[PDB]
Amino acid sequence: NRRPKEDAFTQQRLAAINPVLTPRTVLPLYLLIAVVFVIVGGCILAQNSKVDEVTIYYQDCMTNATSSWSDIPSEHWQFVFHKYKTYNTAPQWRFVDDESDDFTKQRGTCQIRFTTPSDMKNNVYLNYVLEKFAANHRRYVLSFSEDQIRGEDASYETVHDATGINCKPLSKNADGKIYYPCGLIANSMFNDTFPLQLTNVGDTSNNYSLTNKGINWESDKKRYKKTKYNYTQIAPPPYWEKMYPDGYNETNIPDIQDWEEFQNWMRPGAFDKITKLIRINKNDTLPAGEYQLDIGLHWPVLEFNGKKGIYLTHGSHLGGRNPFLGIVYLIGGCICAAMALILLTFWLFGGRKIADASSLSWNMK
Amino acid sequence: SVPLIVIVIITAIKDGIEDSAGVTPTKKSRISRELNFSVILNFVLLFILCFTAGIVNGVYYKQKPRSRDYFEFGTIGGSASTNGFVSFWVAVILYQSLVPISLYISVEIIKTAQAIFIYTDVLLYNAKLDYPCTPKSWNISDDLGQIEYIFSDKTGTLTQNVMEFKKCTINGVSYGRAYTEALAGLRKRQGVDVESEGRREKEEIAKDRETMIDELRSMSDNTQFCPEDLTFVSKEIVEDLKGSSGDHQQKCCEHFLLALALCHSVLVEPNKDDPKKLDIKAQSPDESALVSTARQLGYSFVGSSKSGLIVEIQGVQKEFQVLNVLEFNSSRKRMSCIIKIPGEPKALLICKGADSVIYSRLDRTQNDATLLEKTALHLEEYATEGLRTLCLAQRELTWSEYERWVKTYDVAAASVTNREEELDKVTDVIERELILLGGTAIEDRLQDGVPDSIALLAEAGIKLWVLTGDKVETAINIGFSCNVLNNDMELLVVKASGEDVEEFGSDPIQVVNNLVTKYLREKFGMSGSEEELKEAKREHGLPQGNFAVIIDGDALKVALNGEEMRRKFLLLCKNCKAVLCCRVSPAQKAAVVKLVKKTLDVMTLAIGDGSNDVAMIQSADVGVGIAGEEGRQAVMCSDYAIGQFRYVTRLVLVHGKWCYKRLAEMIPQFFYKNVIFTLSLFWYGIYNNFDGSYLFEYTYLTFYNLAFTSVPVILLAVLDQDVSDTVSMLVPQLYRVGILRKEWNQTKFLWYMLDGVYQSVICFFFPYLAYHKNMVVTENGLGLDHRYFVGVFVTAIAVTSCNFYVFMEQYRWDWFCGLFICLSLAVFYGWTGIWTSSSSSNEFYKGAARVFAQPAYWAVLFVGVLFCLLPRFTIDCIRKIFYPKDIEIVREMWLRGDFDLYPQGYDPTD
Numbered sequence A: 001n002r003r004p005k006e007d008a009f010t011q012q013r014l015a016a017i018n019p020v021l022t023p024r025t026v027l028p029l030y031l032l033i034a035v036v037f038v039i040v041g042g043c044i045l046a047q048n049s050k051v052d053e054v055t056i057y058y059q060d061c062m063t064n065a066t067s068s069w070s071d072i073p074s075e076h077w078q079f080v081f082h083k084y085k086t087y088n089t090a091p092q093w094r095f096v097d098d099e100s101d102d103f104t105k106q107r108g109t110c111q112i113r114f115t116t117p118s119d120m121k122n123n124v125y126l127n128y129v130l131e132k133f134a135a136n137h138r139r140y141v142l143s144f145s146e147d148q149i150r151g152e153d154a155s156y157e158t159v160h161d162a163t164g165i166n167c168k169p170l171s172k173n174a175d176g177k178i179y180y181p182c183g184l185i186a187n188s189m190f191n192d193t194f195p196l197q198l199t200n201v202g203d204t205s206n207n208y209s210l211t212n213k214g215i216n217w218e219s220d221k222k223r224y225k226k227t228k229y230n231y232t233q234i235a236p237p238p239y240w241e242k243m244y245p246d247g248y249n250e251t252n253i254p255d256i257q258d259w260e261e262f263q264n265w266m267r268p269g270a271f272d273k274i275t276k277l278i279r280i281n282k283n284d285t286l287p288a289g290e291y292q293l294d295i296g297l298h299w300p301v302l303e304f305n306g307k308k309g310i311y312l313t314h315g316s317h318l319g320g321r322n323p324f325l326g327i328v329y330l331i332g333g334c335i336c337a338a339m340a341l342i343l344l345t346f347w348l349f350g351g352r353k354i355a356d357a358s359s360l361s362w363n364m365k
Numbered sequence B: 001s002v003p004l005i006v007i008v009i010i011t012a013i014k015d016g017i018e019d020s021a022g023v024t025p026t027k028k029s030r031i032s033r034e035l036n037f038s039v040i041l042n043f044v045l046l047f048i049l050c051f052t053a054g055i056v057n058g059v060y061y062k063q064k065p066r067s068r069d070y071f072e073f074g075t076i077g078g079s080a081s082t083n084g085f086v087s088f089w090v091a092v093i094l095y096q097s098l099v100p101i102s103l104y105i106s107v108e109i110i111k112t113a114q115a116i117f118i119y120t121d122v123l124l125y126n127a128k129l130d131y132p133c134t135p136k137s138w139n140i141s142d143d144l145g146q147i148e149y150i151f152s153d154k155t156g157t158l159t160q161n162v163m164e165f166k167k168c169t170i171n172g173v174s175y176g177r178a179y180t181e182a183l184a185g186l187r188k189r190q191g192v193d194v195e196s197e198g199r200r201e202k203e204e205i206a207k208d209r210e211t212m213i214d215e216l217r218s219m220s221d222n223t224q225f226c227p228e229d230l231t232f233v234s235k236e237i238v239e240d241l242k243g244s245s246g247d248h249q250q251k252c253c254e255h256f257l258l259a260l261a262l263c264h265s266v267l268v269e270p271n272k273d274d275p276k277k278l279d280i281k282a283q284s285p286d287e288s289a290l291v292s293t294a295r296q297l298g299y300s301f302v303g304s305s306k307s308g309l310i311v312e313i314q315g316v317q318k319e320f321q322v323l324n325v326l327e328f329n330s331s332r333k334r335m336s337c338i339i340k341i342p343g344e345p346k347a348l349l350i351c352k353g354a355d356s357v358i359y360s361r362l363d364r365t366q367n368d369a370t371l372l373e374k375t376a377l378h379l380e381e382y383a384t385e386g387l388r389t390l391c392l393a394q395r396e397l398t399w400s401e402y403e404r405w406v407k408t409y410d411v412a413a414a415s416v417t418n419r420e421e422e423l424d425k426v427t428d429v430i431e432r433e434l435i436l437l438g439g440t441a442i443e444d445r446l447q448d449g450v451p452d453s454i455a456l457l458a459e460a461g462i463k464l465w466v467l468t469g470d471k472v473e474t475a476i477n478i479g480f481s482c483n484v485l486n487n488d489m490e491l492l493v494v495k496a497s498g499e500d501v502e503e504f505g506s507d508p509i510q511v512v513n514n515l516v517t518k519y520l521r522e523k524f525g526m527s528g529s530e531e532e533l534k535e536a537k538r539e540h541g542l543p544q545g546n547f548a549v550i551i552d553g554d555a556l557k558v559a560l561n562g563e564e565m566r567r568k569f570l571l572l573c574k575n576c577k578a579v580l581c582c583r584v585s586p587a588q589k590a591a592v593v594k595l596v597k598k599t600l601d602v603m604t605l606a607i608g609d610g611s612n613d614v615a616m617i618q619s620a621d622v623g624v625g626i627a628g629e630e631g632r633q634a635v636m637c638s639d640y641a642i643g644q645f646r647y648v649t650r651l652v653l654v655h656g657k658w659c660y661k662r663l664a665e666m667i668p669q670f671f672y673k674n675v676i677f678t679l680s681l682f683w684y685g686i687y688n689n690f691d692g693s694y695l696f697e698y699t700y701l702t703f704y705n706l707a708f709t710s711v712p713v714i715l716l717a718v719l720d721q722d723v724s725d726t727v728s729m730l731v732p733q734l735y736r737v738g739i740l741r742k743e744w745n746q747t748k749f750l751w752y753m754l755d756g757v758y759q760s761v762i763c764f765f766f767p768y769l770a771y772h773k774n775m776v777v778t779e780n781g782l783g784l785d786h787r788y789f790v791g792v793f794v795t796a797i798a799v800t801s802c803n804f805y806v807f808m809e810q811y812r813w814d815w816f817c818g819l820f821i822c823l824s825l826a827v828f829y830g831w832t833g834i835w836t837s838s839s840s841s842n843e844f845y846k847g848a849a850r851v852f853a854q855p856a857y858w859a860v861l862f863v864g865v866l867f868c869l870l871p872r873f874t875i876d877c878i879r880k881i882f883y884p885k886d887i888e889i890v891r892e893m894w895l896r897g898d899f900d901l902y903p904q905g906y907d908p909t910d
């Protein structure tokens, strides 16, 4: 009726295990964790020591030399292979101009020629790398609309005088028509074209096939929603006037169904370095030989010494060539082993019985 | 606003259902102020962080014009105005995280949690009295581990109010012979034989009882015959009633008995089964014992009549009445009775109390000089063997005296508007004539399991103070009966009375000053006024120099008048265990309590049982009540209550220490677990001219420190068992940790602040350097390459690191803590993998499929947990090897099997 209930929990006597720090217990756990962790570190290092990588920077292949085949400066191309150390094979670059574009500041085609000494394991990725691109500015990164997710077309008030997220900096123009890809994040998109195939100078009868289908997963496929653009209130971004001198008509609307790379740029990079996938090949085993690429030069980058290049790789269980994980694994293994040996020595050197009643802070007297 | 109030109401409702303006009742503790200082330190760290962010956010005037302007073209202008605007609102919207949100409520959450766990202690549950420890104030409980001083009222705490009749002084003759435990203790400490002599004394007392009952049966027949209820054993007085020691002895002895039977405030009620049987219950145990023994010896006071007393002597009935009564007062320390008997009509004013209050006022001109000395010696030995002194003084009023008394009463009855002062003064000034006629002797029994408990507290390194008002000799004898007052120590008595008045009789101030200077110069070295007090307050107390100090009422009364006197008294009271004070009112001892609290502040316990103890508890660091006498009302004006004193041994020593250690360890852990969350953001915001990059999710503002990893810190705060209760009870030396405050300091604050900074360094720079080279680690597809996903990495690392760290410091790996640790990690994983599959994650949207499936996630959390746990675990090992603290030593030795023969929850009272 009133007597308190008796139990282990109400007295805090639940069963427990109290380990203490004694060499009989300390040593085995260290030895086992150390051996297994160093073993897996060696395994991942061995895995990482196999994949290849090539990268070529071409941000300044428009005034470095003339319209002939000149060598790219060494500060732009870096090659890593698992069977060659001094594999220099300096790639060549050429530029071809075209006066069909009024924007003479940055126009033309840059062609590059590189080579590979070995075949490939049927897995090729080609990415475009950007260096020193400030995408972490709040006004820049907090400038995009929510309706573009579903293709909806709301009013200018809902996109200009909205909450902290809106297309505030570039909401309205002189005409007043809103922008479907509003916001500086979309307006500051990389503006380059990449070939859908790779020429093979060795045997031109079979070039190397590429595609831009499958950069990202079906997330965008699970993001796509039916749209209702009014085809009259949508205006090109002010930085897209060269792209759309006539503006959007009832045919040139930017679709999302197939070529999602137009909007794969939605989320910016994690930090200053910028790299996104542009070409994938899973079917064709790439053999050795010399190869050549061609890239447009529409996107201006020299206005602030920004850098831009390409990067071809293979990937692995842990990505591309980056020995940082192996470095940390080895550092941790060495530190843990060193601590284990240090305390083993201190047990040997300071050999004493574990439970010493005289050592208590009240046994002086 | 509303959420805080409603959550407070709901948690109060939970407290109420589990138990069966503002919050703080009176005042907080030192921990509250230290917490305020620590929060101010956190605030100033946030402020300097904001300053070092804002200087860079604005020093870019001479920096290169990067692409921050090539894309925007929205040059607002106004560098002195608009840029400062941006800085101020960025600061006020992005630097609101380091301030503790839930700490201000979590502290009392933890306090009430551990308090209700205290309340549900079935081992703290009384069996006979049936009164468990019921907390009143849920706020102040952390001080119970740092207690270093106990203030005790021996009227009800040290000894129960169960009276026993031993002797009685009538006309200078002591009647009554028995053998109590106090007598045995005195004999054994005197070095004389106690086993054979004790048995001989016991059989002699048995023979005395036999001859007493035989003579009682032979001479007459009494109305209180009883085979087991009889407690009268004194044979000298049973025969000295009629004519044994002369007719004058008879006259004086029955006169004394009648005077005593006319002096009491006791309620007498009949027994329900038998009306004749006595069921005497009242508020004064001593008077109840006196009337009970009067009934046993022949003066049977049966019946409940307030307008007169009806007493029978072997059947002969007689009725009377007491005219005026003045009950015991906290200042009077006596009871007054005015009776008037018609014929030679005569009035009698009788004052009942202790020796100090009765000998203070008497007829100096008219003294017997024979009964006074006899009574003085009688009471001296009575206190020597520990008999509570109860003396009565008589004052006769003749016909002229009765008439002038009536005139004074009728002329002084017209006083209104606080007449009590005038009445007290007039009675004191006109009541200068008193004559003593003797007194009785009563003794008190102790509690259950006092000596072992107080001895183990003393061995715990804590000092206790005990208070009374009767006298010193009974007090020291009660201390000697238990083991709080051992031998091998002399008395630092500073009494301004006694034989010292014969040779150096003067006014008390200078004599007590001379003696305390002697003590402060050539007995102990603290001669000074400032340096010694500061040294004492810096040393924070330690039991050393096992002596005993005694003070008298006059010296304590005059001590409140002198600053030098109070500081020198505080210096000299640094004895080891023994401190005793007598002849003092509750106000005076409350004043000395607050004196010792102010200077060299130390948490003080205020255990008490009575009416004078309320002043102790109302002015104390913490108090505990006792359900004893009518002063049980003190428990409402208290902090904790318990049926008997013997339970508090488990409270302060065991549970209070756990409270102190758990709080003092978990508060720094909570401060550690918060700084990394803001510091990672600070490092991520170094770029973009400190524009204010917001790395984490908009939903991470709360769930990081409110849902996911807030469980194990409070769990360790409340559900920790530092060591088994039994081994702690057998070995209480670990309690020195609360004595020396070896777990609460600013050095620990800074050490964990630096630890948090270093942990944040690892947590931020592991995934960042995992992406420095090519950040193409996807194993399929593109990869993450976004601030939110690297945020997922870093928050996962931080939360698992903090949870494993508090798991590591957790002293009791049980079936309870690890389960909720695993549950916290599981719910973190589940929320991060489920909420990402929703429209509310419009941008992020892909944590589960794009992060967890990646082997890089596990490969990086492995190195994160190693580089978190291993360095500080090795620091823990090296501290436990080169500086092995006592706690882990006793833990491992009892785990090894040394202390396993004893069961769990064993008691010494079994």
Ligand SMILES: *[C@@H]1O[C@H](CO)[C@@H](O[C@@H]2O[C@H](CO)[C@@H](O[C@H]3O[C@H](CO)[C@@H](O)[C@H](O[C@@]4(O)[C@H](O)[C@@H](O)O[C@H](CO)[C@H]4O)[C@@H]3O)[C@H](O)[C@H]2NC(C)=O)[C@H](O)[C@H]1NC(C)=O
Binding pocket: A103, A187, A188, A189, A190, A191, A238, A239, A240, A241, A242, A243, A244, A298, A299, A300, B070, B071
């Ligand atoms: C490829 O993608 C890039 C990325 O945006 C595009 O670059 C952008 O190109 C536009 C077009 O010129 C450019 O807009 C402004 O450029 C000039 C200086 O930046 C500015 O003088 C120019 O203004 C005029 O030329 C316009 O006729 C009109 O604005 O009136 C003024 C005054 O009469 C006149 O000078 C124009 O407003 C963007 O600045 C540029 N982006 C960046 C970051 O520099 C490029 O157009 C895309 N090309 C294709 C083919 O899609």
Ligand SMILES: *[C@@H]1O[C@H](CO)[C@@H](O[C@@H]2O[C@H](CO)[C@@H](O)[C@H](O)[C@H]2NC(C)=O)[C@H](O)[C@H]1NC(C)=O
Binding pocket: A198, A199, A200, A204, A205, A206, A207
């Ligand atoms: C592989 O790519 C090259 C590069 O364009 C192709 O070469 C072109 O071939 C067509 C007709 O065969 C010519 O009209 C072009 O002038 C060639 N271009 C260059 C730059 O030489 C080649 O045909 C492709 N091979 C296959 C099998 O498609």
Ligand SMILES: *[C@@H]1O[C@H](CO)[C@@H](O[C@@H]2O[C@H](CO)[C@@H](O)[C@H](O)[C@H]2NC(C)=O)[C@H](O)[C@H]1NC(C)=O
Binding pocket: A209, A210, A211, A213, A280, A281, A282, A283, A284
């Ligand atoms: C690799 O092979 C697959 C399947 O043969 C190709 O996928 C097809 O691609 C075409 C054009 O991109 C689409 O029209 C088909 O619908 C795809 N088939 C399926 C089942 O999805 C893929 O394009 C090839 N990639 C390369 C680089 O050769």
Ligand SMILES: Nc1ncnc2c1ncn2[C@@H]1O[C@H](COP(=O)(O)OP(=O)(O)O)[C@@H](O)[C@H]1O
Binding pocket: B155, B265, B284, B286, B287, B328, B330, B333, B334, B335, B352, B353, B354, B388, B389, B390, B391, B467, B468, B469, B470, B610, B611, B612
């Ligand atoms: N009901 C009472 N009747 C007569 N004397 C009392 C009564 N209660 C207490 N006293 C006197 O007061 C003394 C008790 O001292 P103590 O209990 O330490 O202080 P206080 O009683 O003021 O709390 C005893 O010596 C006793 O003579």
Ligand SMILES: *[C@@H]1O[C@H](CO)[C@@H](O)[C@H](O)[C@H]1NC(C)=O
Binding pocket: A243, A244, A245, A246, A247, A248, A249, A250, A251, A252
């Ligand atoms: C629409 O504009 C695009 C380019 O902006 C052009 O290629 C296309 O022919 C135009 N179509 C119509 C119907 O105007």
Ligand code: ALF
Binding pocket: B155, B283, B284, B285, B286, B328, B610, B611, B629
């Ligand atoms: F019996 Al009292 F104070 F009078 F404890």
Ligand SMILES: [Mg+2]
Binding pocket: B609, B610, B611, B612, B629, B630, B631, B632
């Ligand atoms: Mg009382």
Ligand SMILES: [Mg+2]
Binding pocket: B611, B614, B633
């Ligand atoms: Mg009271």
